[PDB]
Ligand binder design. Structure first.
Ligand SMILES: [Mg+2]
Ligand SMILES: [Mg+2]
Ligand SMILES: [Mg+2]
Ligand SMILES: [Mg+2]
Ligand SMILES: [Mg+2]
Ligand SMILES: [Mg+2]
Ligand SMILES: [Mg+2]
Ligand SMILES: [Mg+2]
Ligand SMILES: [Mg+2]
Ligand SMILES: [Mg+2]
Ligand SMILES: [Mg+2]
Ligand SMILES: [Mg+2]
Ligand SMILES: [Mg+2]
Ligand SMILES: [Mg+2]
Ligand SMILES: [Mg+2]
Ligand SMILES: [Mg+2]
Ligand SMILES: [Mg+2]
Ligand SMILES: [Mg+2]
Ligand SMILES: [Mg+2]
Ligand SMILES: [Mg+2]
Ligand SMILES: [Mg+2]
Ligand SMILES: [Mg+2]
Ligand SMILES: [Mg+2]
Ligand SMILES: [Mg+2]
Ligand SMILES: [Mg+2]
Ligand SMILES: [Mg+2]
Ligand SMILES: [Mg+2]
Ligand SMILES: [Mg+2]
Ligand SMILES: [Mg+2]
Ligand SMILES: [Mg+2]
Lengths: 144, 81, 150, 129
RNA sequence: UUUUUUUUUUUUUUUUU
RNA sequence: GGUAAUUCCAGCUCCAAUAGCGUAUAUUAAAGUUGUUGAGGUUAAAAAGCUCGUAGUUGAACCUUGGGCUCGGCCCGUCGGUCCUGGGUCGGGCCUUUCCUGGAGAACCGCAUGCCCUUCACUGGGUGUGUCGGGGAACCAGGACUUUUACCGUGAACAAAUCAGAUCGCUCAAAGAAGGCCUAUGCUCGAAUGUACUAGCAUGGAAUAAUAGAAUAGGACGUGUGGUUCUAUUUUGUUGGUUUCUAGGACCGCCGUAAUGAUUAAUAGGGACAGUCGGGGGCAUCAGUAUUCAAUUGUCAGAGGUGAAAUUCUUGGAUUUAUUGAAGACUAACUACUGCGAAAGCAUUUGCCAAGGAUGUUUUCAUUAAUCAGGAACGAAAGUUAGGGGAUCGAAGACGAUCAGAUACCGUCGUAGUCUUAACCAUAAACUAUGCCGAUUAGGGAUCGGACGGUGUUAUUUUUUGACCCGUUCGGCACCUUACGAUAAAUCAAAAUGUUUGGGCUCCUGGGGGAGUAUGGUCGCAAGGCUGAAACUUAAAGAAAUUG
RNA sequence: GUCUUGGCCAGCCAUGGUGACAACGGGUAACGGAGGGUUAGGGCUCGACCCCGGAGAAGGAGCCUGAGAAACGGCUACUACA
């Protein structure tokens, strides 16, 4: 309910109150402040390219015991450094030091998904070749 | 009760309820005549007089105000108008 | 309830339905207005005038007896007080607190009441200026309160 | 502070109706209240209502027949266009053939169905069904 | 009404006349 | 998924969509998780510590109603005329105290004729009309008299394209505005219609919501009379050039006309008056034991303290006994499901100072009111500055115990503080975790203050008052049973009158953390207060009950 | 002075104008709109972009011709680039 005004000439109070209280809405606040353009590792884009700096292993969260294979990637467009998960069995062999890879979102809206702590991006393509294509017997990694 | 004729309540109820809460706020006060001892003059006094009323020319106190009701001086007869 | 207290107490006077003088009054409207003028000329406030007429002379309601309220009678006869009753008693009360507050400085309860008393004066004087009883430039000032009451 | 004497009358009416009482005392008296009562009485949703005269705002005693589901006011009195009656009726009434939305138009206090006949509109002030 | 600290990770249940 | 993997890698089989399918990001619905419709605030996040108060929002009732005469449209029935009927609704005029100039045409009163009629004047004519005359009317055009805003109805105007939507067999369809008919000669329908919120323009409606009107009458009214002043259509010629009456505008007299002019007094509010009521506030004052210390006093070995001890004091008489004095703090028992105060808070006596609610009222004013963004007063304890005081208790500190340790709980000391004057600070689980105003709704008994009525004891009394008893009522602190209701539940007479959802106002909350943190501002002597994020992280955190 | 009105500009005089109904300042990853998407109603969001209006031609300024330009597939000057 609430003690909202109910006069016939209280539209200004009703609009001002709604504008103030709408900031507490998490999704409106994210859009209104433009945090994707400001603080997101991407510039608000769906994908981004970067250079693989090294291969790191991430221990899975409880209850789960495994080493998730990941790579430290420095984005070309802005220089920010992120960690990208390498999906599928044995796909870490395709990725190597100083490769050019394309990253995408990993799940839902920048939040880490699954038992991988602190990893919020995934590798899509390596050297212009899809990771799934490399993982299957479909395409060949560039000769370089 | 689910069925009351509120238009015409009992006169006993009227004397029971508050002076404002009745159907029509009839005041519970009255005007009254004081006969002072030793003289034959009639002075009209409010039932709830807030002042020490003295008769016209007799130089005698007729009532003392206290607690929202005049207390007549002893030795005086009264008759409600 | 009360404007400056919790105070949800109902207590008033119930005017009778008659609107007509009762049969036991044999006084002329000319006589009672002469009584009103004599009392007001002495210095009685219109609130005080009604009390003495009702308690001693048996006038239940001056308006019922005559047709005009006491203040409108006084203004017509040119004996209305320069300052209204409501402000005069409120300003006189505020002056009383000042003389106590000057002597007693630790009385923070008296200090709080003075704010309430002053707030009623400002709200009241705002109403009088709206209807035209007081000049629009009339202002209640702390140190000038005693001068007005005298 | 009293702000809507119309709401006080209808709230008192509805409280007595839900309690099963066959009558209710209404204070104070207003032209809107009497006209609003007469709209009830024409459709039979109430019975006799009697106004007690006084040298102040009057009182009303309404005799209830028990065929009264809900009566309520609308605050504020929204300005309603002719195209807006159907939306107001749909969103506020039961099925659109029992209840009656009360408006105030230049023709006076009158029903939503009567507005469709007279092709007039105004301000919504109450309802019943 | 003397005092008595601690217990390594995960693992502990499903359908109808 | 830990050696029987329906979830990984594969083989087989099957399912969904299919020339498509998956993935990442943005946005919409779901989301009554942004709530105007339409959220939540006792415990899940959330009523500012409390009061005053400006802007804002909202604001008691009251002024032409009732009846009748009618006339017309539409709808609901039977009459179906060719293959006229009642009721309901809506609208129009009249009665019931309810615009002139020129009228070009209107029209009432009789009309030039005309119409019927009591036997009461005969008739064959004349459309458009002239005059006497014109209560009420559309017509043009000049002027006067209209309270003003909000609101609703209608109308005009209001690029295409888009959208909704009509038509046509692009082979259907998305589309497009085409096409169709006659054998031909050439003949023709189309290329519709709706949509203009809010602002602007014109008119009507007059309820609802506002505002003015006559009160020091400086008020209204003329075929009333008299002045001052200003202007000028016309006559014998003269907006140039003035010189009389006279026709209009302003102001001011005397007389008359008139029902001559002010709505209530809200179980709204303010003020006044009377007797009470209170541990409400300030100042000074008085008493009380107790604690500590000291003096005198008699005694001898222990006394304190603990679960048990020890530190500690003690033949210099400790502890204990009696008397007295000093100091400072405090106000026991009485003391309560009692009272006062806005809250924080407030308990010995007396005097003074100012204030307050309730009650009673046939006193007064008459809307003066409610809530409040910023703004302001007060605001426990702790803490700060400068003096005074410093009995007790006691942060810090020092020891003695316990313990593995014991920087603690326990015991002996003990500084700041605890008390007070002047000035700060402005926070509390500042809690009823429950904002303020208003109305209504089930019963009952206690209790406090006031008032009223009755009764009988008791003390006084030229029969009043106090105590006790019963009842009524107003206003409080609460409580007991119940659910016609509410909630998720515990529980609630409010947390009820809410999916049958709108009485007024203010404030706060939007999963858990990060975080009441960083930064900027402002207040403070400082401690800090107020305002107040984001990155990042996470699938729960949490509320009430249930069985173990 | 301008095609013309105008504090548009030059002289003289006065002290005003706006603001809590949010002026002024800041941000926009803001050209405005007709409109696109999605919605029972109430709404949310997007609109550089086939149409209408505005502005610009590496960044400012100035100007000729001309009815019409502060034009840039015109000129002049400065900065950067070449
Ligand atoms: Mg309103
Ligand atoms: Mg899990
Ligand atoms: Mg009240
Ligand atoms: Mg208030
Ligand atoms: Mg005020
Ligand atoms: Mg344990
Ligand atoms: Mg350990
Ligand atoms: Mg441990
Ligand atoms: Mg919610
Ligand atoms: Mg909690
Ligand atoms: Mg909470
Ligand atoms: Mg509170
Ligand atoms: Mg108002
Ligand atoms: Mg005292
Ligand atoms: Mg001794
Ligand atoms: Mg007491
Ligand atoms: Mg005592
Ligand atoms: Mg008093
Ligand atoms: Mg707090
Ligand atoms: Mg709280
Ligand atoms: Mg209430
Ligand atoms: Mg009681
Ligand atoms: Mg009593
Ligand atoms: Mg109480
Ligand atoms: Mg949320
Ligand atoms: Mg949160
Ligand atoms: Mg629990
Ligand atoms: Mg831009
Ligand atoms: Mg751009
Ligand atoms: Mg140029």
């Amino acid at each position: 309910s609430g003690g909202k005004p109910r006069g016939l000439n209280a539209a200004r109070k009703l609009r001002n109150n709604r504008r103030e209280q709408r900031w507490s809405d998490l999704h409106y606040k994210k859009r209104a402040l433009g945090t994707a353009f400001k603080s997101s590792p991407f510039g608000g884009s769906s994908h981004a390219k970067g250079i693989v700096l090294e291969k790191v292993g991430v221990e899975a969260k409880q209850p789960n015991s495994a080493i998730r294979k990941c790579v430290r990637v420095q984005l070309i467009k802005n220089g920010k450094k992120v960690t990208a998960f390498v999906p599928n069995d044995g796909c870490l062999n395709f990725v190597d030091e100083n490769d050019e890879v394309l990253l995408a979102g990993f799940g839902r809206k920048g939040k880490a998904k699954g038992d991988i702590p602190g990893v919020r991006f995934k590798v899509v393509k390596v050297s212009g070749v899809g990771l799934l294509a490399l993982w299957k017997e479909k395409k060949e990694k560039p000769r370089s | 009760v689910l069925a009351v004729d509120l238009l015409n309540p009992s006169p006993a109820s009227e004397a029971r309820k508050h002076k404002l809460k009745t159907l029509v706020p009839a005041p519970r006060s009255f005007f009254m005549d004081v006969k002072c001892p030793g003289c034959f003059t009639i002075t009209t006094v409010f039932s709830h007089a807030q002042t020490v009323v003295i008769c016209q020319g007799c130089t005698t106190v007729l009532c003392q105000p206290t607690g929202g009701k005049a207390r007549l001086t002893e030795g005086c007869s009264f008759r409600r108008k | 309830g009360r404007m400056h207290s919790k105070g949800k107490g109902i207590s008033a006077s119930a005017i009778p339905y008659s609107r007509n003088p009762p049969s036991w009054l044999k006084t002329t409207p000319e006589q009672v207005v002469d009584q009103i003028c004599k009392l007001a000329k002495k210095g009685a406030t219109p609130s005080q005038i009604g009390v003495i007429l009702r308690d001693s002379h048996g006038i239940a309601q001056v308006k019922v007896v005559t047709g005009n309220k006491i203040l409108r009678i006084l203004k017509s006869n040119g004996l209305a007080p320069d300052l209204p009753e409501d402000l005069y008693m409120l300003i006189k009360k505020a002056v009383a607190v000042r003389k106590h507050l000057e002597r007693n400085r630790k009385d923070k309860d008296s200090k709080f009441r003075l704010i309430l008393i002053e707030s009623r004066i400002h709200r009241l004087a705002r109403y009088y200026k709206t209807v035209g009883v007081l000049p629009p430039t009339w202002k209640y000032e702390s140190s000038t309160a005693s001068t007005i009451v005298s | 502070v009293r702000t809507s004497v119309l709401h006080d009358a209808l709230n008192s009416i509805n409280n007595a109706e839900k309690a099963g009482k066959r009558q209710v005392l209404i204070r104070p008296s207003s032209k809107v209240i009497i006209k609003f009562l007469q709209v009830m009485q024409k459709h039979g949703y109430i019975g006799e209502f009697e106004e007690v005269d006084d040298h102040r705002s009057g009182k009303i005693v309404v005799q209830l027949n028990g065929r009264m589901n809900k009566c309520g006011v609308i605050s504020p009195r929204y300005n309603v266009r002719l195209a807006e009656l159907e939306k107001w009726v749909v969103k506020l009434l039961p099925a659109r053939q029992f209840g009656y939305v009360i408006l105030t138009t230049s023709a006076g206090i009158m029903d939503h169905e009567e507005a469709r006949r007279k092709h007039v509109s105004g301000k919504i002030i109450g309802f019943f069904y």
